[PDB]
Structure 1
Amino acid sequence: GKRMDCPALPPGWKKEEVIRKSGLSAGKSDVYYFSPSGKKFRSKPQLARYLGNTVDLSSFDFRTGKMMP
């Protein structure tokens, strides 16, 4: 799966949260982003390198997908 749109980002970006199914950290979740091209990102720096100066992710909270002032 369920990639929801992410309005805090430019049009076409989707956010997906995945619950860990096994292991000691089973239950925890990993958050992933998807560019219009379909590229998978898993960290705010990855995302910053790919968008460059189009959007400031300093106030951007990676887990929720919202701009936190």
Structure 2
Amino acid sequence: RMDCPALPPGWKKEEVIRKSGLSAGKSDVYYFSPSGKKFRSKPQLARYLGNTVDLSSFDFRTGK
């Protein structure tokens, strides 16, 4: 769980490698709120944050 400096304080990003199946070796990216709530996509994260951040130019995968 890495701090994501471009999100507000306490937000973290984690990348997880798939271990088996059709997409073995590909990864999934997750974000965690300061309280530890887990988010799995850009629109889910944007819905949660609302107007407190502008995510138009935010690259969900890299966190930049």
User: Do they fold alike, i.e. is TM over 0.5?
Assistant: yes
Q: Number of matched residues? A: 64
SS of the aligned residue for 1:60 comes to: coil
**Which sections of structure 2, spanning at least 5 residues, go unmatched?**
none
Instruction: Say what the alpha-carbon RMSD is for the aligned residues.
Output: 0.4
Give, in whole Å, the separation in 1 of the partners of 2:61 and 2:47: 18
Q: How big is the shift at 1:24? A: 1.6
Provide the identity percentage: 100
Runs (4 or more) in structure 1 with deviation over 4 Å come to none
Task: Return the TM-score normalized by structure 2.
Answer: 0.98
Instruction: After TM superposition, give the deviation of residue 37 of structure 1 in Å.
Output: 1.2
Structure 2 CA distance for aligned equivalents of residues 64 and 54 of structure 1: 20
Q: Partners in 2 of 1:34 and 1:24 — Cα distance? A: 26
Query: 1:2-35 deviations in whole A, cap 9, x for unaligned?
Result: x000001000000000000000210000000000
Cα distance in 2 for residues equivalent to 1:9 and 1:60: 9
The Cα offsets for residues 44-69 of structure 1, whole Å up to 9 and x where unpaired, read as 01001110101011000000000xxx
Question: Take 1:50 and 1:16, find their aligned partners in 2: how far apart are those partners?
Answer: 18
Match 1:56 to one of 50, 54, 57: 54
Normalising to structure 1: TM-score of the pair?
Answer: 0.91
